[PDB]
Design an enzyme around this catalytic site. Structure first.
Site, mmCIF file in Angstrom:
data_model
loop_
_atom_site.group_PDB
_atom_site.id
_atom_site.type_symbol
_atom_site.label_atom_id
_atom_site.label_comp_id
_atom_site.label_asym_id
_atom_site.label_seq_id
_atom_site.Cartn_x
_atom_site.Cartn_y
_atom_site.Cartn_z
ATOM 1 N N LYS A 85 0.868 -1.160 0.000
ATOM 2 C CA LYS A 85 0.000 0.000 0.000
ATOM 3 C C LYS A 85 0.909 1.216 0.000
ATOM 4 O O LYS A 85 1.606 1.442 0.922
ATOM 5 C CB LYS A 85 -0.928 0.040 1.207
ATOM 6 C CG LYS A 85 -1.913 1.196 1.098
ATOM 7 C CD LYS A 85 -2.782 1.486 2.276
ATOM 8 C CE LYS A 85 -2.639 2.981 2.627
ATOM 9 N NZ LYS A 85 -3.717 3.432 3.507
ATOM 10 N N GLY A 146 -9.139 9.292 8.856
ATOM 11 C CA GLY A 146 -9.595 9.465 10.229
ATOM 12 C C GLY A 146 -10.629 10.490 10.500
ATOM 13 O O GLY A 146 -11.049 10.624 11.643
ATOM 14 N N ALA A 172 -10.338 5.853 2.498
ATOM 15 C CA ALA A 172 -10.079 6.735 3.671
ATOM 16 C C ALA A 172 -11.336 7.512 3.936
ATOM 17 O O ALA A 172 -12.048 7.889 2.989
ATOM 18 C CB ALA A 172 -8.879 7.721 3.429
ATOM 19 N N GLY A 173 -11.589 7.802 5.201
ATOM 20 C CA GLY A 173 -12.625 8.763 5.576
ATOM 21 C C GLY A 173 -13.960 8.129 5.871
ATOM 22 O O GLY A 173 -14.906 8.835 6.286
ATOM 23 N N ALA A 194 -10.118 1.839 8.365
ATOM 24 C CA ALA A 194 -9.469 1.499 9.651
ATOM 25 C C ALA A 194 -10.181 2.269 10.777
ATOM 26 O O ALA A 194 -10.841 1.601 11.593
ATOM 27 C CB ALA A 194 -7.976 1.834 9.590
ATOM 28 N N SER A 195 -10.048 3.601 10.836
ATOM 29 C CA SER A 195 -10.544 4.396 11.982
ATOM 30 C C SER A 195 -11.967 4.133 12.361
ATOM 31 O O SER A 195 -12.262 4.078 13.570
ATOM 32 C CB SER A 195 -10.440 5.877 11.660
ATOM 33 O OG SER A 195 -9.098 6.223 11.356
HETATM 34 C C1 LIG Z 1 -3.874 1.886 4.824
HETATM 35 C C2 LIG Z 1 -4.216 3.342 5.060
HETATM 36 O O1 LIG Z 1 -3.005 4.042 5.485
HETATM 37 C C3 LIG Z 1 -5.490 3.317 5.941
HETATM 38 O O2 LIG Z 1 -5.623 2.221 6.846
HETATM 39 C C4 LIG Z 1 -6.097 4.567 6.597
HETATM 40 O O3 LIG Z 1 -6.028 4.509 8.009
HETATM 41 C C5 LIG Z 1 -7.580 4.459 6.297
HETATM 42 O O4 LIG Z 1 -8.304 5.617 6.570
HETATM 43 P P1 LIG Z 1 -9.472 5.604 7.642
HETATM 44 O O5 LIG Z 1 -8.690 5.403 8.886
HETATM 45 O O6 LIG Z 1 -10.040 6.942 7.579
HETATM 46 O O7 LIG Z 1 -10.374 4.529 7.308
#
Ligand SMILES: CC(=O)[C@@H](O)[C@H](O)COP(=O)(O)O
Ligand SMILES: CC(=O)[C@@H](O)[C@H](O)COP(=O)(O)O
EC number: 2.8.1.10
Lengths: 232, 232
Positions: A85, A146, A172-173, A194-195
């Protein structure tokens, strides 16, 4: 099925581990998400091995192409995988991609034999350039990392989907389940988050919610929704 | 679990049969939806019996309280159930509720021993009046029946959820999976839909999408989503 590079994945939800509070809750969340592919910033690797999940090394925090390329090369040697990534950031307030350094890094890593999945903006010219460079997917942000703001520009996501010949991952987001379903309804092939899970009050419940949401939006995309009409 | 009246339901997706093109596809869609409760406008009843699904007789097309009350009484006698989806419409262009006649019909049917689930607007005073009248749920529309426009006024849905002591069902206008997830994220207890599935190109796929969407939004509501923030 979702095909990226040389792999076929049964799940279209790609998890990240950014924000994880502790390994035991992260384990429960990864199992509940149904994910097959999880990003790890270059304990945690052992956990992915025990769960049967493929690691996706990520160059998080890299500020230049040189820094990202070197990070990726160290990870490939240590972890025995050529998947990465690719994240090159211009700014710490925004975690906004550096498009110039991103494309330079992608060129180098594709030339070095990597399967490259780039964190990018919603710029449709930049997405076509990363695909032409040889990236295995393009991963346009929904909103900054995040922030939980969801998909800020659905029209540009639709433009990227229309002009793509590799999978498009919304990356993301994401803040809640309806955001992930919307990504799939716009035509994305997968969602990376992720967040929204790792910082939820109940991460394993939110991971189960996102697995269901990605399934729901993908099935709705395929099933041919009704037109919008003004009158009943 | 979802509790309405004297029943506990394992599924929070309530299907309607309006728009159904043929019974064989409707069967596949009802199975895929996982629903336990399906509305039928007062073949089809036999199908619900064979599938183990509870019928919810509805007074669709009624233009006055008298017409709705009489329709409900005939259904209770013929079908041996005191549950009713109460629909009183003022207008054929809009299929918009007649609030005055709705409340009159609900009063009469509650006095006659019915479990009343009213199709209503997003007016928070009218939702409190229907609850005070004795309705077993209140079912505010997202947008007009069959329009596929989604949830036109999320703030009024949130106002109704805040002031409710019976379950709140989002009941009309759903177009795609992210709409149903959003309903649950706003705090609804269930979603009722028909057109988005029965008029989809692939109704059984869209029914599976809506089952997943309702699950996804309910889990996200319970799991404590991350706050929205301006900067990453
Ligand atoms: C792999 C990348 O660096 C992501 O895991 C990022 O953290 C995702 O964004 P969100 O945390 O907003 O979902
Ligand atoms: C029971 C009620 O009369 C509904 O089934 C109505 O058809 C639902 O609206 P949508 O068709 O827009 O979902």
């Amino acid at each position: 099925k979702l095909v990226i590079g040389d792999r076929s994945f049964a799940s279209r939800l790609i998890m990240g581990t950014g924000g994880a509070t502790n390994l035991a809750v992260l384990e429960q969340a990864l199992i509940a998400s149904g994910t097959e592919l999880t990003t790890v910033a270059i304990g945690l690797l052992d956990l992915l091995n025990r769960l049967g999940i493929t690691p996706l090394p990520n160059t998080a925090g890299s500020r230049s192409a040189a820094e990202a390329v070197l990070t990726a090369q160290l990870a490939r040697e240590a972890l025995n995988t050529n998947w990465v990534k690719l994240e090159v950031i211009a700014d710490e307030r925004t975690l906004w991609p550096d498009a110039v350094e991103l494309v330079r890094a992608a060129e180098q890593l594709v030339d070095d034999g990597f399967v490259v999945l780039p964190y990018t903006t919603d710029d449709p010219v930049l997405a076509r350039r990363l695909e032409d460079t040889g990236c295995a997917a393009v991963m346009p942000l929904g909103s900054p990392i995040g922030t939980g703001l969801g998909i800020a520009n659905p029209h540009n996501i639709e433009m990227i989907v229309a002009g793509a010949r590799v999978p498009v991952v919304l990356d993301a987001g994401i803040g809640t389940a309806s955001d992930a379903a919307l990504a799939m309804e716009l035509g994305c092939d997968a969602v990376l988050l992720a967040s929204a899970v790792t910082r939820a009050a109940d991460p394993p419940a939110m991971a189960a919610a996102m697995a269901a949401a990605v399934t729901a939006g993908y099935l709705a995309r395929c099933a041919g929704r009704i037109p919008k009409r003004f009158w009943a």
